[PDB]
Write a protein that binds this ligand. Structure first.
Ligand SMILES: CC[C@H](C)[C@H]1C(=O)N(Cc2c3ccccc3cc3ccccc23)C[C@@H]2N(C(=O)NCCCC(F)(F)F)CCC(=O)N12
Ligand SMILES: CC[C@H](C)[C@H]1C(=O)N(Cc2c3ccccc3cc3ccccc23)C[C@@H]2N(C(=O)NCCCC(F)(F)F)CCC(=O)N12
Ligand SMILES: CC[C@H](C)[C@H]1C(=O)N(Cc2c3ccccc3cc3ccccc23)C[C@@H]2N(C(=O)NCCCC(F)(F)F)CCC(=O)N12
Ligand SMILES: CC[C@H](C)[C@H]1C(=O)N(Cc2c3ccccc3cc3ccccc23)C[C@@H]2N(C(=O)NCCCC(F)(F)F)CCC(=O)N12
Ligand SMILES: CC[C@H](C)[C@H]1C(=O)N(Cc2c3ccccc3cc3ccccc23)C[C@@H]2N(C(=O)NCCCC(F)(F)F)CCC(=O)N12
Ligand SMILES: CC[C@H](C)[C@H]1C(=O)N(Cc2c3ccccc3cc3ccccc23)C[C@@H]2N(C(=O)NCCCC(F)(F)F)CCC(=O)N12
Ligand SMILES: CC[C@H](C)[C@H]1C(=O)N(Cc2c3ccccc3cc3ccccc23)C[C@@H]2N(C(=O)NCCCC(F)(F)F)CCC(=O)N12
Ligand SMILES: CC[C@H](C)[C@H]1C(=O)N(Cc2c3ccccc3cc3ccccc23)C[C@@H]2N(C(=O)NCCCC(F)(F)F)CCC(=O)N12
Ligand SMILES: CC[C@H](C)[C@H]1C(=O)N(Cc2c3ccccc3cc3ccccc23)C[C@@H]2N(C(=O)NCCCC(F)(F)F)CCC(=O)N12
Lengths: 182, 186, 187, 184, 186, 181, 187, 184, 184
């Protein structure tokens, strides 16, 4: 990670209100991004924030930490998908400010149902199944609100792995514009 | 080392017991144990359709489907299959103990009987976890329904009493309806 | 430990004694070894008597599709009716072989579990290698679904839909589906 | 890499601590407890009157480490606000409920889970007995405090924590674990 | 390798079984219990009145597997003599004490050890509680029987089995675990 | 990593608009290079950027993160292959500014088809197969545009591992000139 | 992830800032490295001021007995009173050090856990080697129990009995026992 | 690959057992003790007067397993001759000395080793104490019996077994562990 | 692996019927126990007729080797030794131990001689005991080699200091064998 005159490259980007979601989403990544969003709001509550997304997703709860923080703060959080947005990464891509969700032409967007595990007694498995099913209902309802697609459509389209191009993601309502070279 | 006995005709001890219509369920229940026991049951009813069979149970249970292989074979064949719990009957072992011929389910005085929920697991997509959950819940309802029929307890009582690990003495198993008599020394 | 029995005085292991009365055991995961044994037993029994029925016990989670088709083709070629009986569970290629038994002689005991689902596999390497592997397993599924349609009387369209995910059936549901003919009830 | 901010260079979490914000964003072990307790002590010394803000995104962990944080919160003069962002499970949800009365929050999609303590024991029958009595007393201790913090009966807490019990933010408010669901 | 003897070929242990001698010469698990129980049942069927001789060189093991052997000994008509050779520890010493009254022996340098049951528990507090209650009940069951067969109080048995308690053959006789130290003919 | 008078060697190069792609391409490497590209264009949108490429390739999506960032920004991004460029590395070599794609005489260039895997149900294998086949068409279509070769020729020449010299890479259209001493 | 704090300027990591106000953290398993650090901090603080109290925070499951006695002996030698405060838990040699604080200045917060038990160890080899190891750990227990008796006011016989097995105590029970002087109740 | 002798077919060791020869040719564990004890019981039942021959090529092992064999040898009526061929170490040497008085042998290059018992202990101080007292009492037991078998004092045995003590066949005869060195 | 020949015999048991013993493996206690038992069986059948010891072995345990050695020297029958393939370490010692004038090797058979291998770990006095033991074992081996080859102890010491490979002809000249058996 190179230095620029004294900032590391990512910290220099943060000076211009740019946050990097460039890894698998766990609690540590969520804690950092939430802290960055809170800091940028405190500096200036009016100016836009830019969330770079190159992520395969990961933890749903960690994703919702980022999601809820985005929606609470006053500044518009722009989202731009560069490389790939999968699973909870694509959920956060769709969570960006209305009209300011982007993807570069060859960026990959994938949507699919949440993954999990359960082990032990029948009633413990039932509790785990009800939890992940309710979690999917929560994700689908919000994605419906964000994309303009129905919950029934999102349910069917996320049953298996569903890879989308940048243009297909725009047509779906996950992003607003495919950002072309000027 | 399984010992040999000579009656001339040499027998390993378990095969000698099988000659007198005795089957040993003395291990964890998997498909191999089920295949052996159902084959022994088929052989014995073919040899004699009237004479009782004796099923020894010292088992911590295991596979539910492997257990139901043994269960269904016991109920289909004409001979009464007596069950005797010696040492311990846990989980699907206690289910098979309760599945013996009415009036011929036994345990020795210090034998341990345990009943609880079916165990399992699932990993992957939410809909895959749902399928696994529905399957194991249906499997529990199936087991509890049969236990209710075999013991005379209500399905609601079986559900409550199998929620956690429930250890029973031989006398408690008799009171519950899992066995008919605690076998005492003469 | 497989127990021994004596017919008074020829000694047999329990499974060999069953084979004397035309009973073959499919009681494990289906691999090439299990297929070779079952194919050899079927060829032996039909050579002894081409008219008497053979009885195939099925307590199996399935396994290799090619090994399953070794057993399937042998069953269909030989003259004797091969009866099938599901005891415990028949999953995947085990349930396929359950449905492959002689017409009107496919059975399950009341608490036996039958599961149907699409074939499993894997592929790794170049895109064209993944394509070949994908085309192979899709063609294998169509092959399985077409034969299962013939044996059950259900459509290829229905079988495709019903085998998309793991589909557990009771013995009575398996009868309704056409995978078996009768649920064997106790007297 | 944790990002830096310069205005004096700060890592992002240390910059938040300057404005009386403490992060509980991991599994609770002794190291996390020692850090949070030290931060609370420091913030009390800096300003005994201004509120402290405890961010909670944690699956819980050690009960004793959790009680290190709990007791420090209750001792110090400043109110400690708690805010659940992402998820609060087990001892994390206990600490969420331990925030200053009227100042316990959760964001709308945050997850709260409550259940009984986990543990293990191995060896002699009397050694297993000691371990069982200890974890049972620890559960009574936790349930008694949770009853006081939520206003629910100990009997209800016992029943509701027997198995894994997932709650929405609104359900956590209705239960008494938090005071308000913070809306955008 | 187990040596063969020909009078009709026998492995050495099978030859001993012909004279009503059963070998408990290993750690007690379900397999060992299944074998010993089957041998006892076979010997009772052969002769319901002649004594059986149970050799014990064992560190113990499974309590439920031990109780399979224990209950089978007490049910059958023939007296089961017990002889400790080498060592009897834990459930091995319990079975030594379970022999027919007046027919429990040890050789002069044989080692007897008694202690409390060993086990484990993991998971939720209520699951640990169930596991703890179970092992405590199992110890009560063992101590009550040991009290009956030694003549010692349950209070004394509890205290003396709190830790590993090694006894000589002579101390085991004094305690009531055996009846006589079998001395060599000079 | 030595220091120079105070900059580490790679940071000193970044001051003269030089970016180093000297490793396997994963998301971390892509995030760093994308950030460096965005930094340099913000400093100066007119002056050229020099992308050093010594890489065996790696993730296709991580590669396309770098690719799209290069094409979007105003500055010409020169590409110089030193040592080796394989797979996605050779794709990024061909993605440099027109007339400013270079390789040193003994630099190695390799092209082949994308690598991947799939495991599970037949329909899951089908989805994975369709995805990687679409990814190959995407790569081959862009490589056809950058090199001037037909898609049918790219398909044939990338079927197996195809090693090229620097001069062969110039002939193929992957680079513009072999930079002589 | 240890946070930094700045005061107008001078930057400190949180634990170094606490050390500036004579606070030492025993917040881990006790090994030689932890003992070396704490002994060095104690020596530093007494050199800075021989009269002002030192505050020893204890959240520790214990560990090495010799490493514990390095801390114990340093505490007793230096002139300043070393206050001890149990927060979270003090087990084994951690609870021994809790009891070693200045008379009247040993504290615990209300929900802090205190545990006392026997020294743990092991030995493998010859009978005489096992004898040496046994005599050593027994002598170490006598040494620990004698000091505990002195600092708690309980008899050595009572300490022996109560430390035979794992003995968990509440903060209040630890006060009644004499391991601490006061439970710090919140205002 | 144990060779067959016809072859009436016999494996070589079973053929030797027909002429009252028992092989102690491995590490002594409970399995080896059970077999040897069973063979001794079989041979005395066949003939209580004729001698038994115990071949010893063993590094020893379990003390309790060794005492199973020891007590069985002393109880039965037949004289049990012992012959050390190759090596007798630890409990193997103890059983060599346990043979019938006047009928304990070794071949000229056979190795005899004596040393104190080995063991372990782990856990609480009182558990280590119990383990220590047990292994010490076992050493006293071994030394007392070895004193009876050899005619050497317990005090001498203690000192001579403090460390590993290798003896030649002639030195073992001088010690009283054997009676004669068998020459060609 | 081992084929049958027809009374049915496995190939090695058939060879034992004509007084042929196979030392075709690494020498451990199990191999020694079998070979000494075979030697005891053959001399019991006939004390006059020769025994033939096939040797294709890399050596191994010295004590297990001396179990075989002492048994060879004690019994009445001449034990012929023939090296086929290779005799290394204690295998070459046993090759030299064959009856005088009846020790053989085939033309391309390999014979290797070298000093004993071992290990020691622990206290200085424990290392001393182990060192004295293996040094005394070397003197024991070298003294017997000297007697059976005709070479001096000083020469055996020097020639076995490192690994010393010998041809069949060199082994004859050294005194380890009596003749290189030629094809007729
Ligand atoms: C939108 C946040 C509110 C203003 C409110 C709040 O809800 N919260 C709760 C809250 C968090 C609290 C702690 C850690 C992360 C938090 C993230 C939040 C995200 C959304 C809403 C509230 C959050 C705290 C916030 N604080 C600051 O941001 N302080 C300024 C320091 C910022 C920086 F420069 F240090 F970065 C502390 C004081 C305060 O009232 N709030
Ligand atoms: C109760 C058995 C039925 C009468 C019926 C049957 O349902 N089945 C199906 C069936 C099984 C079939 C194969 C393997 C196991 C089986 C177990 C069954 C259990 C219950 C019911 C049927 C079973 C087969 C049975 N066979 C034998 O038992 N033959 C005698 C075998 C003797 C010996 F070999 F056992 F000695 C083959 C002929 C036959 O009609 N049946
Ligand atoms: C149905 C069998 C056919 C008549 C034909 C055949 O197609 N085949 C081909 C064939 C197989 C050939 C080899 C191994 C397995 C085979 C399985 C087959 C299954 C179905 C059809 C042919 C099979 C061989 C068969 N053979 C035997 O069965 N011989 C008797 C074997 C008796 C015993 F050993 F079983 F007891 C050899 C002679 C022969 O003509 N055939
Ligand atoms: C509420 C704190 C009390 C006033 C008291 C105390 O109870 N304790 C005990 C105590 C702790 C002691 C050490 C480490 C952590 C502690 C956490 C505590 C939590 C609650 C109560 C007491 C604690 C210590 C406190 N110290 C400081 O905080 N000093 C100020 C410097 C703080 C910083 F800036 F350095 F952070 C040292 C002097 C002192 O008397 N106390
Ligand atoms: C004490 C045995 C009872 C008489 C009764 C019984 O309670 N049981 C139950 C029972 C067991 C049953 C199966 C396996 C083990 C058993 C062990 C038992 C131990 C104690 C009491 C009953 C046991 C079975 C017994 N059987 C035999 O022993 N048959 C003789 C053949 C023995 C051998 F020679 F084959 F060994 C079968 C007939 C029968 O009625 N019983
Ligand atoms: C090409 C940049 C566009 C003009 C636009 C944009 O599309 N984006 C989106 C965008 C990214 C956003 C975040 C992180 C990486 C990004 C990479 C991009 C690559 C290509 C196109 C847009 C990118 C951001 C850009 N920002 C800066 O670069 N700001 C100054 C950067 C200075 C410094 F920090 F580097 F020093 C923030 C404001 C802004 O308008 N944009
Ligand atoms: C109580 C200390 C004694 C007065 C004496 C001593 O016994 N010792 C021995 C002694 C130790 C010596 C070295 C390391 C640790 C020590 C810990 C001790 C604990 C108790 C008693 C003596 C110790 C050394 C002490 N030194 C300092 O502390 N020097 C001051 C520097 C302090 C700091 F700032 F550097 F920390 C060096 C000179 C000196 O005479 N002593
Ligand atoms: C010296 C043996 C005594 C006579 C006595 C005895 O003490 N015991 C106890 C005893 C053992 C008992 C069981 C197993 C092993 C035993 C080993 C013993 C060793 C020494 C002394 C008693 C032993 C049993 C002996 N039995 C036989 O040997 N029976 C003949 C069996 C011959 C054959 F099977 F080997 F061929 C069974 C009856 C019996 O009274 N005893
Ligand atoms: C040379 C052997 C002596 C004659 C003597 C003896 O020294 N010993 C001691 C001795 C051994 C004893 C047991 C096992 C192996 C032995 C190997 C020996 C090797 C050398 C010398 C004595 C050995 C035993 C020998 N026995 C037999 O060989 N019995 C016949 C065996 C026939 C058959 F089984 F082999 F076929 C038992 C009786 C006996 O007096 N001896």
């Amino acid at each position: 990670i190179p230095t620029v005159i004294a900032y590391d490259i990512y910290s220099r980007l943060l000076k211009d209100r740019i946050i990097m979601l460039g890894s698998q989403i766990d609690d540590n990544v969520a804690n950092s991004i939430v802290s960055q969003l809170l800091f940028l709001q405190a500096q200036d509550s009016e100016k836009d924030i830019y969330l770079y997304i190159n992520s395969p997703g990961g933890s749903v709860t960690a994703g919702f930490a980022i999601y809820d923080t985005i929606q609470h703060i006053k500044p518009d959080v722009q989202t731009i998908c560069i490389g790939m947005a999968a699973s909870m990464g694509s959920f956060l891509l769709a969570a960006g400010a209305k009209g300011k969700r982007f993807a570069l032409p060859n960026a990959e967007v994938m949507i699919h149902q949440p993954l999990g595990g359960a082990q032990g007694q029948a009633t413990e498995i039932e509790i785990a199944a009800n939890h992940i099913l309710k979690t999917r209902e929560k994700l689908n309802r919000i994605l419906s609100e964000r994309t303009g697609q129905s919950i029934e459509k999102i349910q069917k389209d996320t049953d298996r792995d569903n890879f989308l191009t940048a243009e297909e993601a725009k047509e779906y309502g996950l992003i607003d514009e495919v950002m072309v070279p000027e």
